[PDB]
Short mmCIF file of C-alpha atoms and ligand atoms in Angstrom, two decimals:
data_model
loop_
_atom_site.label_atom_id
_atom_site.label_comp_id
_atom_site.label_asym_id
_atom_site.label_seq_id
_atom_site.Cartn_x
_atom_site.Cartn_y
_atom_site.Cartn_z
CA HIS A 1 -12.77 9.92 18.84
CA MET A 2 -10.12 9.47 16.16
CA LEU A 3 -10.77 7.89 12.75
CA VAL A 4 -7.90 6.70 10.57
CA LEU A 5 -8.45 6.21 6.85
CA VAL A 6 -6.02 3.71 5.32
CA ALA A 7 -5.39 2.40 1.79
CA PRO A 8 -4.02 -1.07 0.86
CA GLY A 9 -1.09 -2.13 -1.32
CA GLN A 10 -0.24 -4.81 -3.89
CA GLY A 11 -1.83 -8.18 -3.33
CA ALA A 12 -5.14 -6.68 -2.23
CA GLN A 13 -6.55 -6.54 -5.77
CA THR A 14 -8.51 -9.47 -7.23
CA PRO A 15 -10.20 -10.10 -10.61
CA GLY A 16 -13.35 -8.01 -11.09
CA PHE A 17 -13.11 -6.25 -7.72
CA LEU A 18 -13.91 -2.81 -9.17
CA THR A 19 -17.07 -3.95 -11.00
CA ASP A 20 -19.67 -2.84 -8.43
CA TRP A 21 -17.84 0.45 -7.87
CA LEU A 22 -17.93 1.33 -11.58
CA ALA A 23 -21.70 0.94 -11.44
CA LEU A 24 -22.07 4.01 -9.22
CA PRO A 25 -23.37 6.99 -11.24
CA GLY A 26 -20.38 8.97 -12.47
CA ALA A 27 -17.77 6.35 -11.54
CA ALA A 28 -17.22 4.97 -15.03
CA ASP A 29 -16.79 8.56 -16.24
CA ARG A 30 -14.12 9.46 -13.66
CA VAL A 31 -12.18 6.22 -14.17
CA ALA A 32 -12.28 6.73 -17.96
CA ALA A 33 -10.76 10.21 -17.62
CA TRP A 34 -8.03 8.76 -15.39
CA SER A 35 -7.41 5.98 -17.91
CA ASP A 36 -6.93 8.54 -20.69
CA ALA A 37 -4.55 10.53 -18.49
CA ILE A 38 -2.23 7.62 -17.69
CA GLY A 39 -2.66 5.58 -20.86
CA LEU A 40 -4.15 2.51 -19.18
CA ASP A 41 -7.67 1.05 -19.34
CA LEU A 42 -8.38 0.99 -15.60
CA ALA A 43 -11.99 -0.14 -16.11
CA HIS A 44 -10.85 -3.23 -18.01
CA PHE A 45 -8.25 -4.29 -15.46
CA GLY A 46 -10.69 -3.76 -12.62
CA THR A 47 -13.56 -5.67 -14.25
CA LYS A 48 -12.65 -8.14 -17.03
CA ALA A 49 -8.93 -8.77 -16.52
CA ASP A 50 -8.03 -12.07 -14.87
CA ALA A 51 -5.33 -12.93 -12.33
CA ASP A 52 -2.28 -12.77 -14.60
CA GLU A 53 -3.21 -9.34 -16.00
CA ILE A 54 -3.69 -7.62 -12.64
CA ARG A 55 -0.58 -9.21 -11.15
CA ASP A 56 1.27 -6.95 -13.59
CA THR A 57 2.94 -4.54 -11.17
CA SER A 58 2.68 -1.68 -13.69
CA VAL A 59 -1.08 -2.31 -13.76
CA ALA A 60 -1.73 -3.20 -10.12
CA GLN A 61 -0.33 0.02 -8.65
CA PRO A 62 -2.46 2.55 -10.57
CA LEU A 63 -5.51 0.27 -10.34
CA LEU A 64 -5.23 0.13 -6.54
CA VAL A 65 -4.89 3.91 -6.26
CA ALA A 66 -7.90 4.57 -8.50
CA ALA A 67 -9.94 2.11 -6.43
CA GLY A 68 -8.97 3.83 -3.18
CA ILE A 69 -9.67 7.33 -4.46
CA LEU A 70 -12.95 6.18 -6.00
CA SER A 71 -14.28 4.36 -2.93
CA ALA A 72 -13.24 7.20 -0.62
CA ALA A 73 -15.00 9.68 -2.91
CA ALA A 74 -18.14 7.51 -2.76
CA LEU A 75 -17.91 7.31 1.04
CA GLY A 76 -17.87 11.10 1.17
CA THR A 77 -21.20 11.60 -0.61
CA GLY A 88 -18.58 14.93 3.41
CA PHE A 89 -16.07 14.16 6.16
CA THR A 90 -12.48 14.62 7.28
CA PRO A 91 -10.58 11.77 8.99
CA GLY A 92 -8.28 12.30 11.97
CA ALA A 93 -5.35 10.82 10.05
CA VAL A 94 -4.46 8.89 6.89
CA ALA A 95 -1.91 6.28 5.85
CA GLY A 96 -1.41 3.42 3.43
CA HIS A 97 0.69 0.34 2.71
CA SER A 98 3.39 1.07 0.10
CA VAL A 99 1.32 2.03 -2.97
CA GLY A 100 -1.42 2.93 -0.50
CA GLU A 101 0.78 5.84 0.59
CA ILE A 102 0.14 7.61 -2.69
CA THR A 103 -3.58 7.00 -2.19
CA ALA A 104 -3.31 8.51 1.30
CA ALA A 105 -1.51 11.56 -0.13
CA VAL A 106 -4.68 12.30 -2.08
CA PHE A 107 -6.83 12.00 1.06
CA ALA A 108 -4.53 14.46 2.86
CA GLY A 109 -4.66 16.91 -0.03
CA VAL A 110 -0.95 16.61 -0.79
CA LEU A 111 -1.57 15.57 -4.38
CA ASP A 112 -4.67 15.75 -6.56
CA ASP A 113 -5.88 12.45 -8.01
CA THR A 114 -4.60 12.75 -11.60
CA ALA A 115 -1.15 13.78 -10.37
CA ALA A 116 -1.17 10.82 -7.98
CA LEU A 117 -2.28 8.33 -10.63
CA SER A 118 0.39 9.71 -12.97
CA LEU A 119 3.01 9.27 -10.25
CA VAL A 120 1.93 5.74 -9.35
CA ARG A 121 1.72 4.71 -13.03
CA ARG A 122 5.41 5.69 -13.19
CA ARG A 123 6.02 4.02 -9.82
CA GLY A 124 4.71 0.70 -11.12
CA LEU A 125 6.58 0.82 -14.41
CA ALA A 126 9.83 1.87 -12.71
CA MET A 127 9.70 -0.93 -10.14
CA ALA A 128 8.86 -3.48 -12.84
CA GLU A 129 11.86 -2.32 -14.89
CA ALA A 130 14.16 -2.41 -11.86
CA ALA A 131 12.98 -5.93 -11.00
CA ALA A 132 13.68 -7.06 -14.58
CA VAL A 133 17.40 -6.28 -14.50
CA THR A 134 17.60 -8.62 -11.52
CA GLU A 135 16.52 -12.05 -10.28
CA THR A 136 14.99 -11.02 -6.95
CA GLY A 137 11.80 -11.42 -4.96
CA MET A 138 10.01 -11.28 -1.60
CA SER A 139 8.90 -14.04 0.77
CA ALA A 140 6.77 -13.90 3.91
CA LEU A 141 7.96 -15.69 7.05
CA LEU A 142 5.17 -17.60 8.81
CA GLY A 143 5.81 -18.06 12.52
CA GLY A 144 8.90 -17.33 14.58
CA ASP A 145 10.03 -14.25 16.47
CA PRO A 146 10.28 -10.96 14.52
CA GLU A 147 13.66 -9.82 15.89
CA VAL A 148 15.31 -13.25 15.64
CA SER A 149 13.85 -13.61 12.14
CA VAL A 150 15.17 -10.22 11.06
CA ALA A 151 18.63 -11.00 12.46
CA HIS A 152 18.71 -14.31 10.59
CA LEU A 153 17.44 -13.14 7.20
CA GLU A 154 19.73 -10.10 7.32
CA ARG A 155 22.69 -12.33 8.17
CA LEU A 156 21.87 -14.26 5.00
CA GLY A 157 21.93 -11.02 3.05
CA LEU A 158 18.20 -10.31 2.85
CA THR A 159 16.44 -7.15 4.02
CA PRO A 160 13.22 -6.93 6.05
CA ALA A 161 11.26 -5.25 3.24
CA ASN A 162 7.96 -5.45 5.13
CA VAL A 163 7.53 -5.14 8.90
CA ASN A 164 3.74 -5.27 9.06
CA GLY A 165 3.04 -5.68 12.75
CA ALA A 166 1.44 -8.57 14.61
CA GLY A 167 4.89 -10.12 14.30
CA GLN A 168 4.68 -10.33 10.50
CA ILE A 169 7.91 -10.10 8.49
CA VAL A 170 8.55 -10.18 4.72
CA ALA A 171 12.08 -10.88 3.51
CA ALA A 172 13.42 -9.63 0.17
CA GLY A 173 16.58 -10.10 -1.84
CA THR A 174 17.98 -12.22 -4.67
CA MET A 175 16.36 -15.53 -5.57
CA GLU A 176 19.52 -17.33 -4.38
CA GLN A 177 19.28 -15.70 -0.95
CA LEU A 178 15.54 -16.31 -0.74
CA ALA A 179 16.22 -19.97 -1.53
CA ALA A 180 18.96 -20.09 1.12
CA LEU A 181 16.43 -18.62 3.55
CA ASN A 182 13.96 -21.42 2.84
CA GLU A 183 16.62 -24.10 3.23
CA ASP A 184 17.99 -22.50 6.39
CA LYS A 185 14.96 -20.93 8.07
CA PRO A 186 15.09 -18.70 11.16
CA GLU A 187 14.32 -20.53 14.40
CA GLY A 188 10.60 -21.10 14.83
CA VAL A 189 9.68 -20.16 11.26
CA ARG A 190 7.43 -22.83 9.75
CA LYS A 191 7.25 -21.57 6.19
CA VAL A 192 8.96 -19.11 3.87
CA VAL A 193 6.29 -18.23 1.32
CA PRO A 194 7.29 -16.40 -1.87
CA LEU A 195 5.07 -13.42 -2.71
CA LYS A 196 3.52 -12.80 -6.12
CA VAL A 197 5.78 -9.88 -7.01
CA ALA A 198 8.27 -9.13 -9.78
CA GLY A 199 11.20 -8.43 -7.48
CA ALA A 200 12.78 -7.28 -4.24
CA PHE A 201 10.61 -4.20 -3.74
CA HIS A 202 11.57 -2.00 -0.79
CA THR A 203 15.28 -2.84 -1.00
CA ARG A 204 18.35 -1.29 -2.65
CA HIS A 205 17.47 -3.38 -5.68
CA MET A 206 14.92 -0.63 -6.41
CA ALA A 207 17.61 2.08 -6.50
CA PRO A 208 17.09 2.62 -10.25
CA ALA A 209 13.35 2.96 -9.59
CA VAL A 210 14.07 5.89 -7.25
CA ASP A 211 15.88 7.72 -10.05
CA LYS A 212 12.99 7.19 -12.47
CA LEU A 213 10.31 7.97 -9.89
CA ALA A 214 12.16 11.15 -8.87
CA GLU A 215 11.96 12.37 -12.47
CA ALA A 216 8.18 11.95 -12.46
CA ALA A 217 8.00 13.75 -9.11
CA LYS A 218 9.52 16.80 -10.85
CA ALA A 219 6.27 17.52 -12.67
CA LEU A 220 4.46 17.75 -9.35
CA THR A 221 3.95 20.55 -6.85
CA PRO A 222 2.83 18.90 -3.57
CA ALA A 223 0.75 20.79 -1.04
CA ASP A 224 1.13 20.49 2.73
CA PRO A 225 -1.11 17.76 4.17
CA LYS A 226 -4.45 19.07 5.47
CA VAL A 227 -4.91 15.92 7.55
CA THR A 228 -2.31 14.11 9.66
CA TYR A 229 -0.24 11.96 7.28
CA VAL A 230 1.53 8.91 8.76
CA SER A 231 4.55 7.62 6.80
CA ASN A 232 5.74 4.05 6.08
CA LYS A 233 9.40 4.98 6.50
CA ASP A 234 9.33 5.36 10.27
CA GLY A 235 5.66 5.67 11.23
CA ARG A 236 6.01 9.41 11.79
CA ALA A 237 3.56 12.16 10.92
CA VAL A 238 4.92 14.35 8.12
CA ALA A 239 3.83 17.99 8.11
CA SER A 240 5.55 19.05 4.88
CA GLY A 241 4.20 18.33 1.40
CA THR A 242 7.68 18.15 -0.15
CA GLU A 243 8.83 15.81 2.63
CA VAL A 244 5.77 13.65 1.95
CA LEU A 245 6.68 13.45 -1.74
CA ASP A 246 10.38 12.82 -1.09
CA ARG A 247 9.45 9.99 1.26
CA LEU A 248 7.12 8.43 -1.35
CA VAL A 249 9.90 8.46 -3.95
CA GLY A 250 12.44 6.95 -1.58
CA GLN A 251 10.08 4.34 -0.11
CA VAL A 252 10.27 2.15 -3.22
CA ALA A 253 13.72 1.19 -1.92
CA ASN A 254 13.15 1.40 1.85
CA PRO A 255 11.44 -1.12 4.19
CA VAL A 256 7.72 -0.65 4.91
CA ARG A 257 7.34 -0.09 8.65
CA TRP A 258 3.60 -0.60 8.87
CA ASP A 259 4.21 -1.78 12.44
CA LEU A 260 5.32 1.73 13.41
CA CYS A 261 2.40 3.28 11.55
CA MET A 262 -0.01 1.32 13.76
CA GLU A 263 1.98 2.30 16.86
CA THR A 264 1.47 5.92 15.82
CA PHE A 265 -2.28 5.36 15.34
CA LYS A 266 -2.25 4.23 18.99
CA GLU A 267 -0.33 7.31 20.07
CA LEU A 268 -3.01 9.33 18.27
CA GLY A 269 -5.74 7.54 20.22
CA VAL A 270 -7.31 5.90 17.16
CA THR A 271 -10.83 4.59 17.87
CA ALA A 272 -11.83 3.45 14.37
CA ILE A 273 -10.12 2.49 11.11
CA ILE A 274 -11.71 2.31 7.67
CA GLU A 275 -9.71 0.69 4.87
CA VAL A 276 -10.68 1.85 1.38
CA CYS A 277 -11.30 -0.49 -1.55
CA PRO A 278 -10.06 -3.17 -1.92
CA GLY A 279 -10.08 -3.70 1.84
CA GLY A 280 -9.43 -6.68 4.05
CA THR A 281 -5.65 -6.93 4.40
CA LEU A 282 -4.95 -3.86 6.56
CA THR A 283 -8.19 -4.44 8.47
CA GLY A 284 -7.04 -7.96 9.30
CA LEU A 285 -3.77 -6.58 10.65
CA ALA A 286 -5.60 -3.96 12.71
CA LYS A 287 -7.81 -6.59 14.35
CA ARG A 288 -4.62 -8.23 15.60
CA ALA A 289 -2.38 -5.30 16.52
CA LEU A 290 -5.06 -2.78 17.51
CA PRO A 291 -7.46 -4.48 19.95
CA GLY A 292 -10.43 -2.34 20.98
CA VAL A 293 -10.40 -0.41 17.70
CA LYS A 294 -13.42 -0.64 15.39
CA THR A 295 -12.44 -1.64 11.86
CA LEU A 296 -14.31 -1.68 8.57
CA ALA A 297 -13.09 -2.67 5.11
CA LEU A 298 -14.74 -1.28 1.99
CA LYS A 299 -15.11 -4.09 -0.53
CA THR A 300 -18.24 -3.04 -2.46
CA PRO A 301 -20.63 -0.04 -2.52
CA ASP A 302 -22.95 -2.09 -0.29
CA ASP A 303 -20.41 -1.52 2.51
CA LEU A 304 -20.89 2.27 2.31
CA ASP A 305 -23.90 2.67 4.63
CA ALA A 306 -22.09 0.91 7.48
CA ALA A 307 -19.02 3.02 6.72
CA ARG A 308 -21.01 6.26 6.86
CA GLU A 309 -22.32 5.29 10.30
CA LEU A 310 -18.79 4.64 11.50
CA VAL A 311 -17.62 7.94 10.04
CA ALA A 312 -20.45 9.87 11.70
CA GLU A 313 -19.71 8.51 15.19
CA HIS A 314 -15.94 8.95 14.95
CA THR A 315 -15.58 12.33 13.23
NI1 NI B 1 -5.18 -14.16 -18.66
#
């Protein structure tokens, strides 16, 4: 048996999704301490804030990490997964699970991650758009020829293009063969492209205040789907990833190579679990959406750990 614990990225959060989790004894207290540490009312954005407030990239990133750490903590009340990984921001969440970074240090890093990427996006008119349908390699060749970069390679043939708004518009007018729709994502800019270069500089400064430990659990990286044994290499990869494509496809290939038998996606789950059901047939999957999902999760943990 091999259980893989994964954490989601931007887009997974929805209004009021943290509500039930804050109701768990001690949860409001932990989140409040985190909020004071990063200067952001996490409880508010996870409970009362509407769509426009949580779409704020500087808010969404730390909120997602706190949700992942919180739900995982609840699920372990212990256990140790066979491996961990996450989608973009979810990588910071996974660093906590592997013991590379403690939670406050991670939330502090991701708070800076979100602000830095927002700022980088502001000095530019860029974005990201998902390609629905078509062939992944032909699609990549086409979008790249138009000047875009394959910011997200999520597996199951899914591709997300990123670049300037002009290029994204040219992509929609001249779509790759077989692509039915080019859907713009709800993001501030071309994340995971060179357009985030200034975000790397800012994020690297925040990484200076950290002292990462070597992962205690196998840590799979978005850069190339490889397992990283060094804590400093984990951190360097996190800092650089804001400007590098997300190869979630390779991460899933690695889960296969590891003989994964079950995958649990922390709160707010659904997105990575949906991908797993497509690219990882025969693998049990469970997404944590509310505390009521915990009992089923514990059973899955018990039989796969
Ligand atoms: Ni509003």
